[PDB]
Amino acid sequence: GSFTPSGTTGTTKLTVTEECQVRVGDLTVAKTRGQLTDAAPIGPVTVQALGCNARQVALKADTDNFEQKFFLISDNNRDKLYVNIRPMDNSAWTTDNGVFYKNDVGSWGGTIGIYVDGQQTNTPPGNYTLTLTGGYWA
Amino acid sequence: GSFTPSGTTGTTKLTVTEECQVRVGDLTVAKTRGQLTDAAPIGPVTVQALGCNARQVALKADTDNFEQGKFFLISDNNRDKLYVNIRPMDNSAWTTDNGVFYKNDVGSWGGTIGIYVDGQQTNTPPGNYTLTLTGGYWA
Amino acid sequence: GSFTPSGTTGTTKLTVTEECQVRVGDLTVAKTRGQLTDAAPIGPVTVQALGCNARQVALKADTDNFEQGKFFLISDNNRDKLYVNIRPMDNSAWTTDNGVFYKNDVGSWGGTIGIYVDGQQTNTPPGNYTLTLTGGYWA
Helix, strand or coil: CCEEEEEEEEEEEEEEECCCEEEECCCCEEEEHHHCCCCCEEEEEEEEEECCCCCEEEEEECHHHECCCEEEEECCCCCEEEEEEEECCCCCEEEECCEEEECCCCCCEEEEEEEECCCCCCCCCEEEEEEEEEEEEC | CCEEEEEEEEEEEEEEECCCEEEECCCCEEEEHHHCCCCCEEEEEEEEEECCCCCEEEEEECHHHECCCCEEEEECCCCCEEEEEEEECCCCCEEEECCEEEECCCECCEEEEEEEECCCCCCCCCEEEEEEEEEEEEC | CCEEEEEEEEEEEEEEECCCEEECCCCCCEEEHHHCCCCCEEEEEEEEEECCCCCEEEEEECHHHECCCCEEEEECCCCCEEEEEEEECCCCCEEEECCEEEECCCCCCEEEEEEEECCCCCCCCCEEEEEEEEEEEEC
């Protein structure tokens, strides 16, 4: 099985902060380390496939967003926040080295929820990101 | 003549995908190589020149978006290119001079600049292509 | 006292142009050098401090946005600069300490920070200027 890039690239950006969070400029997903408890929901990624009725929809994370496990990477390319990626509808998906594809072919379209994998309330403040690219599995 | 930078910089981003395009995020201008036929319309650029009553409104593309009097979107790898044609929705007369696309007549013009595929290029490798244009006048 | 980074980073982008102003993009703030008079208002930065009921809300500008107790927008060339004044429309009391703009009183303040031109600089070369500010507290 190999992932074929065929879609747009989405990004989940989260700004971890101390209890005293000062949101300057535009508004984004901001969370204090304290809120980084297990199962804690981060953002959500909207996916929409077209003309994929004979292929398995899949999402591919940047090389710096997965290892052995998905996680958001700090701007320093150091600190990481381990998260779990699952669709809103209870569709069945598989995780294969940075790839998250649907077990059944079809032009699926829904929401992919991002949650904190295990309490990590000690996560250093900063800007974390998680990039995912559309495509199919085959 | 020469182009004088005096305005904002706009960008036309197109994502080329295979027949099975999976849009992660929301939203962009995605198109399958199959749709990359000749005259195929990509995105559109809205232009608004003001105080240009004695000058000629002009648009300047990045050095990596033009060559030999030909405009094209560049891949994120600064390698693959999609040749496109620049033309206003209204049939106004413009001129192309080395990456510069200026209007033949002076005055403050405003409207939409349509971007179309120049010749069928359905073999264009998938990826993220862009076309940057900067506002200014010609002299 | 030192500034502790704890919030998001905002940015004020301005595009100085000549009287002939050609807007190519969808939306991006533009202004001709002529409008760059003293007290001239640029953009505005929204500030939302939360859980800061025992800390002094503060804003920190990039190293290339301040110098000698003076704030300014920097050109894309890291050369030209537009000196501006930072002030809360709440008329609240703030202090400027080497790139840091913090509130004199603790509390989870939330409002608008107005950006105005510091002294007439109508000769400012055209280009893209920016001013980055990061949320956090002072102590």
